[PDB]
């Protein structure tokens, strides 16, 4: 039920006999996977986790100085000398100053003056690199089990039945994971962290308990003191003159000064930069998509063998409507019959009693055996006016529903979305290895690209007339001697035969 209130929601349906199915997950969206006999699953990607990041360079915005010393020699004495020059922690500058009898020596000529002082970095910021083997994605998996749908369980402490929700950590070391959903069964996932945001031109900047991302060509352009890329208590700094300002000149000395806090300059320069969050030493990124392949072999239903409900069904409120034309129904059941299957139908008139639409949640069931229990389901009503009927006998309730739009419009939108998805799945879509899965791959993707329109167009899914139409179309394409008219017709005929062979 985690996929209900999401703006960017898709719909993926696989072949009836097709166990494998590929999907793409975006960091701001969700994916709903449904089948004929398998329960509906909902996949979401929460956060990109970066851990164990190496350090490349650290800059020092605010620094201090101490023990300023200077030494002056006038002409015919050579260059000035100081013992602290050989020390790596003391920075000095040389210069030439005018001298005379007022300064101690007689010959009038410019003298050599040197001035150095210590350098201590009181505050600093750091830059880290990001390697593909360090990334770790987190995906939550939910199951439509006719849950109550109440938002009271925000954290992961409790109120989360381990058979209804799960979390999976996809790492670059082992991309193959086995997910256990308890009574529902087990699934397999193989995710490939590719075609994401480039991490070869990005540096993770940590500064004053805040974090940003910067460009590598800009990080080296910054004009501040910097050290070598090693972990040392005290490291040989470089280009520290940019933080120590020397006066013009003096006949006997030179007084250096240190610049103030450069935090404001960095905050102003990083205005148009991306931000992130961090916990301890790990970082969280909210950008990046993922491609995955799911194997659904041991996944089954939970209430397929249950009986019918012989109690009283009642609406809890007016059924709401989502942006994707899906209707959520919240039912309250009275009686003590235990877990029983919920008899619900969608038709065009109260006397017709003919299924006209499909259900997003397969096998709606009540979870507890209480007297007055509650449950929720999600369905897809047909375009136009429709009637939802719940229950049997003289106690069955009916409700009117309306939905705007057109079937052809939705079909074309879904076809375009599937084409865009298949275009995103450029690599790792087919397999050119052992033979026997190539035809399976071409059938699988033609299904994933055309089934949304096949189900919407070809009548009431009789599975008998469509085969005859395909046969007659193949015959019409066969008895044609002209070029470019038999190949396309036979291809379309085979496509329709295969799409009818799959689940409708």
């Amino acid at each position: 039920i985690r996929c209900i209130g999401i703006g960017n929601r898709d719909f993926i349906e696989g072949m009836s006999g097709g166990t494998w199915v590929d999907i793409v997950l975006e960091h701001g969206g969700c994916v709903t996977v449904m089948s004929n006999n398998k329960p509906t699953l909902d996949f979401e990607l929460v956060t990109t986790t970066a851990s164990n990041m190496a350090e490349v360079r650290s800059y020092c915005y605010e620094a201090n100085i101490s023990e300023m010393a200077s030494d002056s020699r006038c002409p015919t004495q050579g260059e000035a000398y100081l013992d602290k020059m050989a020390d790596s922690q003391f920075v000095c500058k040389r210069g030439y100053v005018d001298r005379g009898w007022g300064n101690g020596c007689g010959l009038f000529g410019k003298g050599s003056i040197v001035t150095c002082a210590k350098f201590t970095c009181v505050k600093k910021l750091t830059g880290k690199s990001i390697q593909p083997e360090n990334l770790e994605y987190r995906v939550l998996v939910s199951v439509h089990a006719s849950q109550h749908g109440g938002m009271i369980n925000n954290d992961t402490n409790h109120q989360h039945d381990k058979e209804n929700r799960a979390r999976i950590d996809i790492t670059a070391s082992a991309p193959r994971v086995e997910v256990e959903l308890g009574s529902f069964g087990s699934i397999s996932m193989e995710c490939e962290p590719r075609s994401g945001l480039n991490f070869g031109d990005l540096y993770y900047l940590t500064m004053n308990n805040k974090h940003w991302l910067v460009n590598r060509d800009w990080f080296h352009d910054l004009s501040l003191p910097w050290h070598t890329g090693a972990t040392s208590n005290n490291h040989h700094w470089n280009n520290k003159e940019a933080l120590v300002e020397f006066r013009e000149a003096h006949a006997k000395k030179q007084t250096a000064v240190v610049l103030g806090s450069q935090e404001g300059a960095v905050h102003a320069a990083l205005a148009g930069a991306l931000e992130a969050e961090s916990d301890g030493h790990k970082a969280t990124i909210y950008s990046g998509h993922l491609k995955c392949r799911l194997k659904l072999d041991k996944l089954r239903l939970k209430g397929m063998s249950y009986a019918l409900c012989t109690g009283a069904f009642t609406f809890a409120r007016t059924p709401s409507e989502t942006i994707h034309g899906t209707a959520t129904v919240e039912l309250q059941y009275a009686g003590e019959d235990g877990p029983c299957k919920v008899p619900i139908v969608i038709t065009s008139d109260t006397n017709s009693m003919a299924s006209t639409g499909r259900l997003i949640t397969a096998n709606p069931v009540v979870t507890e055996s209480g007297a007055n229990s509650k449950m929720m389901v999600e369905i897809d009503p047909p375009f136009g006016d429709s009637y939802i009927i719940v229950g049997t006998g003289t106690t069955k309730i009916t409700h009117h529903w309306h939905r705007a739009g057109s079937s052809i419009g939705r079909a074309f939108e879904a076809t375009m979305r599937g084409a865009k998805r298949m275009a995103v799945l450029g690599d790792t879509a087919w397999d050119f290895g052992s033979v026997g899965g190539m035809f399976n791959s071409v059938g699988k993707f033609v299904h994933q690209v055309f089934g949304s329109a096949f189900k919407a167009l070809f009548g009431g899914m009789s599975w008998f007339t469509q085969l005859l139409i395909g046969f007659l179309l193949i015959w019409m394409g066969l008895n044609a001697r002209g070029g470019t008219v038999a190949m396309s017709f036979m291809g379309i005929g085979a496509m329709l035969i295969f799409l009818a062979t799959s689940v409708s």
Partner: protein, 101 residues
């Protein structure tokens, strides 16, 4: 002020209170009266400015010099900070700018 000698050179530890006054001490040559005109002198703290100030003949006026003695050249040292708050003046106002992006 304190007067010491470490390695045949005289150091004059002058605090903030002795600012603008002369002082007489003793050297191997004899008595030495040395005047101090330190303008940027501060209180006692780790930030210590030290510079040799040279001997000169009394028949010349000091030019761009704030320390002078007459026995030899004397090294002066004094702290430079504000209200003994362990903080330097650091009033540079350079305001270095960085590229945006």
């Amino acid at each position: 002020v304190e007067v010491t000698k470490k390695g045949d050179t005289y150091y004059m530890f002058a605090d903030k209170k002795d600012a603008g006054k002369v002082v007489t001490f003793e050297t191997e040559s004899g008595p030495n009266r040395c005047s101090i005109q330190a303008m940027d002198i501060g209180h006692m703290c780790p930030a210590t400015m030290s510079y040799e100030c040279p001997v000169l003949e009394p028949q010349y006026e000091p030019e761009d010099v704030d320390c002078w003695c007459n026995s030899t050249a004397a090294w002066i040292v004094y702290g430079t900070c504000t209200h003994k708050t362990t903080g330097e003046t650091r009033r540079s106002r350079r305001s270095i700018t960085l590229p945006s992006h």
